[PDB]
């Protein structure tokens, strides 16, 4: 009564808003057989998204 | 956009005109050099030969 904890209001995010994520479950069959190499762009190692 | 679709099985290699239809890797073009700096890791080995 005499003294209460103040709480902590007025907080930030310097990181990118969401709350959501997509992960990976299964691998692509990076090499195989009927297609080339050079079709995929991991191989020319391009990240995204 | 530039849209490289192998040839399956023998097919002739294709890219994508800006009007819609898909044509294939011959005659006269027209890149700008920002469509080259895109891709060029990727574009070298999809048209030196």
């Known amino acids: 009564l005499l003294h209460a904890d103040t709480p902590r209001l007025v907080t930030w995010d310097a990181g990118l808003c969401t709350s959501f994520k997509i992960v990976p479950i299964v691998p692509a069959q990076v090499p195989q057989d009927v297609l080339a190499y050079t079709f995929f762009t991991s191989s020319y190692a391009i990240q995204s998204p | ?49």
């Open chain 2, 1 to 49: 956009d530039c849209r490289i679709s192998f040839g399956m099985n023998g097919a002739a290699p294709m890219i994508r005109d800006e009007t819609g239809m898909m044509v294939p890797f011959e005659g006269n073009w027209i890149f700008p050099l920002a469509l080259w700096q895109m891709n060029t890791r990727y574009f070298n080995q999809q048209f030196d030969a």
